Amino acid sequence: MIKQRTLKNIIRATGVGLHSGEKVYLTLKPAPVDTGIVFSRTDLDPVVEIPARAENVGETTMSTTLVKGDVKVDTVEHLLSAMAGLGIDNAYVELSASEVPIMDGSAGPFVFLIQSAGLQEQEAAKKFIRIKREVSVEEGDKRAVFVPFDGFKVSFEIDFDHPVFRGRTQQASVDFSSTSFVKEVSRARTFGFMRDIEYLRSQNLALGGSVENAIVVDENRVLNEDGLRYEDEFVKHKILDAIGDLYLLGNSLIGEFRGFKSGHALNNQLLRTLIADKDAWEVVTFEDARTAPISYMRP
Numbered sequence: 001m002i003k004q005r006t007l008k009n010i011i012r013a014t015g016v017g018l019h020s021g022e023k024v025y026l027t028l029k030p031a032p033v034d035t036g037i038v039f040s041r042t043d044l045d046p047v048v049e050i051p052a053r054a055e056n057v058g059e060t061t062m063s064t065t066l067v068k069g070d071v072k073v074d075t076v077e078h079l080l081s082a083m084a085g086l087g088i089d090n091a092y093v094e095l096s097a098s099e100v101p102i103m104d105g106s107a108g109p110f111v112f113l114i115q116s117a118g119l120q121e122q123e124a125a126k127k128f129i130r131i132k133r134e135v136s137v138e139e140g141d142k143r144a145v146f147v148p149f150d151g152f153k154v155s156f157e158i159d160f161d162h163p164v165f166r167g168r169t170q171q172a173s174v175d176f177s178s179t180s181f182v183k184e185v186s187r188a189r190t191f192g193f194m195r196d197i198e199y200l201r202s203q204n205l206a207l208g209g210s211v212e213n214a215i216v217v218d219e220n221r222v223l224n225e226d227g228l229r230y231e232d233e234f235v236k237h238k239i240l241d242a243i244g245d246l247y248l249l250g251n252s253l254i255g256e257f258r259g260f261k262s263g264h265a266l267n268n269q270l271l272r273t274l275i276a277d278k279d280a281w282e283v284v285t286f287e288d289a290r291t292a293p294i295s296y297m298r299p
């Protein structure tokens, strides 16, 4: 059978919140079967735990934020994308502050942490959610769609309307597996445009962001000395974000996601739209791993 997995060892990292600019200590720990990914605010008394589930997404302004009462865990998407990419079903994520550290702006440092801690297979069937029929959401010039597919395909289209793109809409599609996640997605960094600084300043956002942990674009060009990791790094990051936001469903999806200028808000609305359409999806397990729809790394 296709099994659930967790981490084999505890591992630690330090960084800063992209939006808060606050130093934060992170600890990843193994967790039991059927736990999912759970964030724990160990700086609070009492300690507050927030499951990383779509229903706990309370804010989606330039990040995905989990909320339980007055307690928040911000910017969960890049970590969650790495957990999804490596097939980590269950884990605890302890934080000393309200925001996951941004690291280098990509999921690469989280792939490092997960692979260095190692994986532990658990004796429980992995439950997948399979898309049976098309579901979509649309807010203005943004749209997000699920359609059936036997695997997990993440497609994205976005026109950034900036000179670095040479007037070309950015498009990419990834046939998801742990290997294609590592190869094609994991290292794509977050990004910002200087045209948006007044907006960010006014909302006290991106306080921890710079060329050290993000691609920064001025009126003409990418400011980062070494340029881009991928020619299509911007759209590949949008795919990284979608993988992390979609993992908040609580189960790996068997289907195709198509994003059209979509972001965190619409990603969460698509999950709520899908969940509510009870006949558009089903829960499945695999007794015979030879029919597995998605290839995950072995522990």
Ligand SMILES: C[C@@](CCn1ccc(-c2ccccc2)cc1=O)(C(=O)NO)S(C)(=O)=O
Binding pocket: 018, 062, 063, 064, 077, 078, 190, 191, 192, 193, 194, 197, 200, 205, 206, 209, 210, 211, 214, 216, 237, 238, 241, 263
């Ligand atoms: C929502 C974004 C983007 C987050 N994000 C990153 C970087 C900056 C920034 C950094 C330095 C200078 C100016 C802006 C601002 C910001 O808001 C995402 O990556 N969320 O995970 S996105 C790429 O989808 O727009």
Ligand SMILES: [Zn+2]
Binding pocket: 077, 078, 190, 237, 241
């Ligand atoms: Zn992102």
